[PDB]
Amino acid sequence: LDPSVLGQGSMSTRIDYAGIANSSRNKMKITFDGEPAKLDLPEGQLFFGFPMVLPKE
């Protein structure tokens, strides 16, 4: 029902955000439960592919 770009779109299949998250886990569902892992992107790139959390409501 939601657009696929909400977690997996362009620049998420290029930069394996899912891969980074799961490899940090074992150190596919993505959640902010756990710990962060370094995600270093080159100067001049902005990433907006983080999973949406919506307002508290």
Binding site: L1, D2, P3, V5, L6, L41, Q45, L46, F47, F48, F50, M52, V53, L54, P55, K56
Partner: peptide
């Protein structure tokens, strides 16, 4: 990122509990 509603609306991705500006 426009929502699926018929009108022209966008999701509130950035708000109080989540990030305002990401790290990058």
């Amino acid at each position: 990122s426009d929502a699926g509603a018929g009108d022209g609306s966008v999701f509130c991705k950035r708000h109080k509990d989540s990030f305002f500006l990401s790290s990058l």
